[PDB]
């Protein structure tokens, strides 16, 4: 089972629905759920930090990103929270409205197994990672954003700026599946 | 603006025309249009699910009915699709041909503000809501149909079995206007 920290965004139920389409169970929990409670449940195999409105309003996610042992995927706000946690920089950017964005995969790692090298993703660039933390690498970019996806170079910590959980993101469910594979799930 | 999901019926342009007559702009879209693309457009204030021929051919409507935050009105197939989405039952009924039907308003809430208690409506009863979903209430009925109109008890989700968009439906435009009032529009 995958625990989804609800950072209060509009696509949190989509994460659950999209995981259900590939056979993976998940539980949406408050973003204040302590890490010890998450990791002591032996049913939990990974954590997703969801999108939401306010980077200041999701600081328990910083503790989770730093200290979790389980694999972690941050989506949009979640990707930004992971960057801040590890000392990278986040700030405002121009293209705030939701749009289809052509993403270019720089390193297949994982997120992008069995995904083409270019695909269109549903994304909002109101905020973005300005500086990738130390010991992280960029995995994908777009014409308007240098960091559409990143991961830690050796730990199972991943971030995407776009939303894989919505239908407009081509191969979104396969990106989710790849994260679930890191969490130990098997797929035929 | 109101988005109209085109379920392939013969009165879809009538919805747009009738809305224009009361000063409300609308855009007819494919019934496969994802909910995220609808709700991310800040000009959209509500959603109408149109009539059409095939309840199996309009399941993106079920996702919309379940998960939209914007007000929704379903017309004939649309009303049926909303019932099915929330766990009610739909099935065949006798009076399949289009006819003028005398509709009795049981609860004004809403659709029927500034509408008389009884009025004649253009309707086909090939299919009908056999069991209103849990958490819904009936608003209107006829001699041959227990559920001429329904709504969710607290959410802005509405269904009508008849076509308010056609001229033969008395006060049709006022029913549409009432839905538009729930969507934030002002008249007077």
Swiss-Prot record, chains A, B:
Top EC category: ligase
Record carries keyword Cell membrane: no
Organism: Methanocaldococcus jannaschii (strain ATCC 43067 / DSM 2661 / JAL-1 / JCM 10045 / NBRC 100440)
Function recorded in the entry: Catalyzes the synthesis of GMP from XMP.
Pathway membership: Purine metabolism; GMP biosynthesis; GMP from XMP (L-Gln route): step 1/1
Active site residues according to the UniProt entry: 76, 163, 165
InterPro entries associated with the record: Class_I_gatase-like (IPR029062), GATASE (IPR017926), GMP_synth_GATase (IPR004739), GMP_synthase_A (IPR023686)
Gene Ontology molecular function terms on file: ATP binding; GMP synthase (glutamine-hydrolyzing) activity
PROSITE patterns, per database record: GATASE_TYPE_1
Alphabetical list of Pfam families matching this protein: GATase
All residue ranges annotated as the Glutamine amidotransferase type-1 domain in the record: 1-188
HAMAP family the record matches: GMP_synthase_A
Subunit structure: Heterodimer composed of a glutamine amidotransferase subunit (A) and a GMP-binding subunit (B).
Identification of the protein by name: GMP synthase [glutamine-hydrolyzing] subunit A
Tree of life domain: Archaea
E.C. number: 6.3.5.2
């Amino acid at each position: 089972m995958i625990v989804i920290l609800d950072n209060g965004g509009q696509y949190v139920h989509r994460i659950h629905r999209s995981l259900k389409y590939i056979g993976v169970s998940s539980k949406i929990v408050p973003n204040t759920t302590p890490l010890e409670e998450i990791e002591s449940n032996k049913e939990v195999k990974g954590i997703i930090l969801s999108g939401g409105p306010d980077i200041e309003k999701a600081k328990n996610c910083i503790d989770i990103a730093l200290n979790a042992k389980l694999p972690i995927l941050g989506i949009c706000l979640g990707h930004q929270l992971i960057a801040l946690a590890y000392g990278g920089e986040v700030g405002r950017a121009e293209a705030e409205e939701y749009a289809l964005t052509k993403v270019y995969v720089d390193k297949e790692n994982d997120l992008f197994k069995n995904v083409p090298r270019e695909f269109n993703a549903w994304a909002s660039h109101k905020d973005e990672v300005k500086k990738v933390p130390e010991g992280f690498e960029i995995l994908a970019h777009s014409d308007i954003c240098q960091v559409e996806a990143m991961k830690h170079k050796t730990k199972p910590i991943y971030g995407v700026q776009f939303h894989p959980e919505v239908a407009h993101t081509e191969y979104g469910n396969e990106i989710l599946k790849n994260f679930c594979k890191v969490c130990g799930y098997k797929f035929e």
